[PDB]
Amino acid sequence: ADIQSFSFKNFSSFILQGDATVSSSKLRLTKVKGNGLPTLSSLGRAFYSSPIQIYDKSTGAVASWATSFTANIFAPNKSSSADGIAFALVPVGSEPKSNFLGVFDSDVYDNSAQTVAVEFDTFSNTWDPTSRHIGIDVNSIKSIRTASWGLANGQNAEILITYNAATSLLVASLVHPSRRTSYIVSERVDITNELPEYVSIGFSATTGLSYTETHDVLSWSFASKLPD
Amino acid sequence: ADIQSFSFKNFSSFILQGDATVSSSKLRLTKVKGNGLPTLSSLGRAFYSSPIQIYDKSTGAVASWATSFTANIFAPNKSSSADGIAFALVPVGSEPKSNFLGVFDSDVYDNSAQTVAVEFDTFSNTWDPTSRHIGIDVNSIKSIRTASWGLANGQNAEILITYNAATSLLVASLVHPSRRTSYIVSERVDITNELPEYVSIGFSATTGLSYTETHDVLSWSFASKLPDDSTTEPLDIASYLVRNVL
Numbered sequence: 001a002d003i004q005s006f007s008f009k010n011f012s013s014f015i016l017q018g019d020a021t022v023s024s025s026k027l028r029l030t031k032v033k034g035n036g037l038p039t040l041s042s043l044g045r046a047f048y049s050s051p052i053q054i055y056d057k058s059t060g061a062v063a064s065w066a067t068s069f070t071a072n073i074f075a076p077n078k079s080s081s082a083d084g085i086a087f088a089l090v091p092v093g094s095e096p097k098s099n100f101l102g103v104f105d106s107d108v109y110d111n112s113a114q115t116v117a118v119e120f121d122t123f124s125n126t127w128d129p130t131s132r133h134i135g136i137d138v139n140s141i142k143s144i145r146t147a148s149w150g151l152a153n154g155q156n157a158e159i160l161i162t163y164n165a166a167t168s169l170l171v172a173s174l175v176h177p178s179r180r181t182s183y184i185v186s187e188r189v190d191i192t193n194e195l196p197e198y199v200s201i202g203f204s205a206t207t208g209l210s211y212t213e214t215h216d217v218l219s220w221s222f223a224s225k226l227p228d
Numbered sequence: 229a230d231i232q233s234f235s236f237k238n239f240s241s242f243i244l245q246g247d248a249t250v251s252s253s254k255l256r257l258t259k260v261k262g263n264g265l266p267t268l269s270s271l272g273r274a275f276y277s278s279p280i281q282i283y284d285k286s287t288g289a290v291a292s293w294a295t296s297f298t299a300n301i302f303a304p305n306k307s308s309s310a311d312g313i314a315f316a317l318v319p320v321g322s323e324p325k326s327n328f329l330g331v332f333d334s335d336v337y338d339n340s341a342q343t344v345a346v347e348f349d350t351f352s353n354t355w356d357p358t359s360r361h362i363g364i365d366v367n368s369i370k371s372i373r374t375a376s377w378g379l380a381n382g383q384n385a386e387i388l389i390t391y392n393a394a395t396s397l398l399v400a401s402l403v404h405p406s407r408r409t410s411y412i413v414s415e416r417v418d419i420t421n422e423l424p425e426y427v428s429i430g431f432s433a434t435t436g437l438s439y440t441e442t443h444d445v446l447s448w449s450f451a452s453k454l455p456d457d458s459t460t461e462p463l464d465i466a467s468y469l470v471r472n473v474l
């Protein structure tokens with residue numbers, strides 16, 4: 001049984017791409033002006049330095065894992081929030097994608113993407129459902145299951161994602177303690193077909209073009225357990 | 229930092245009350261006939277042998293904790309399901325209560341009860357909301373927040389309860405993998421006012437009088453983390469799970 005875990009409360013163990021930056025001991029994924037306001041046309045991704053193994057081609061074994069983290073998103077003009085943030089598993093060398101939250105290129109299934117992510121969509125792209133949602137994306141910006149999400153502008157969101165290899169079920173939940181609100185989404189996912197043996201875990205967030213908000217991760221914890 | 233944790237996949241580390249029984253390496257809380265069918269007018273509670281400390285009067289510190297477990301509930305005649313099952317924190321010597329799921333006596337707040345529980349109500353007692361729900365009970369069978377729950381008769385339910393001392397927020401979620409269904413309920417809870425420094429954790433389940441189902445716990449995991457300074461530090465679920473649950 002191979003185990004890999006970590007816990008950060010204060011964010012060089014990360015690989016940053018684009019506007020991704022850490023300051024104030026907190027990961028800030030999208031751009032922010034001197035005044036401290038967001039930025040239009042931004043994109044940033046942050047990934048853990050050491051790659052983790054999802055499954056083993058030989059043994060056939062598949063790891064069950066879990067991850068949690070807290071994040072605050074502030075969008076002046078709540079109604080002009082965009083585009084959102086996502087937790088993802090991408091192929092190692094992976095260079096950013098479309099600005100789609102920087103992880104996908106189209107709303108059409110493309111196994112070649114070898115990318116799976118949990119999105120926290122704040123702007124509804126008329127593939128997207130009518131309101132802010134939590135979605136499970138498998139090789140396409142078109143989620144395979146979504147859930148209504150009451151966004152608490154400025155407030156923190158404590159989220160928890162888990163993947164049970166036995167049931168092949170992936171589950172996610174955002175929770176705003178400020179308002180005692182809670183949400184979940186579940187969905188089977190054949191991880192062996194959607195991704196590589198080894199992937200990179202992390203975050204990716206974008207902002208609008210014409211519509212922006214902040215994307216700051218506050219704490220991050222992770223653990224994976226691969227059998228023989 | 230004082231830590232207490234455990235994990236059971238195969239159920240004498242438990243204190244049983246009433247019809248509570250373990251057989252087939254699985255905790256069976258309500259009665260079952262030879263034929264294997266439920267039983268009317270049943271009640272059973274099961275608790276971990278060692279008591280756990282929720283907070284410290286002196287230090288002022290309050291522990292953040294989490295618990296998970298899998299359970300199957302079968303009720304022939306789905307529409308005649310009753311009464312449900314609950315996870316609870318009760319004062320140590322605690323003898324069972326009303327048959328209310330065996331943990332409360334009235335729908336009126338009574339601090340003297342010093343009991344807090346997460347209910348999985350299957351029969352709607354016209355205090356209860358119209359359909360099966362998940363509720364947070366604080367010293368009363370009248371939940372302080374509830375959530376609609378789609379019951380998968382016979383199928384397993386993987387549940388997870390957590391209490392963040394920093395936010396004083398308590399959260400719960402049942403999940404039926406058979407049907408990829410999920411549910412949550414959240415609610416602030418001033419644990420220091422609702423319970424004793426030391427409590428007993430466990431389960432309690434009842435059945436109807438006139439209406440029954442089975443209440444079998446399959447696996448149980450738990451972890452608590454008490455600090456020294458009033459300063460609270462939520463747990464590591466990311467870890468507590470894979471390591472304990474997955």
Ligand SMILES: [Ca+2]
Nearest residue numbers: 121123124125
């Ligand atoms: Ca969108």
Ligand SMILES: [Ca+2]
Nearest residue numbers: 349351352353
């Ligand atoms: Ca009831």
Ligand SMILES: [Mn+2]
Nearest residue numbers: 121128135143
């Ligand atoms: Mn979407």
Ligand SMILES: [Mn+2]
Nearest residue numbers: 349356363371
């Ligand atoms: Mn109720």
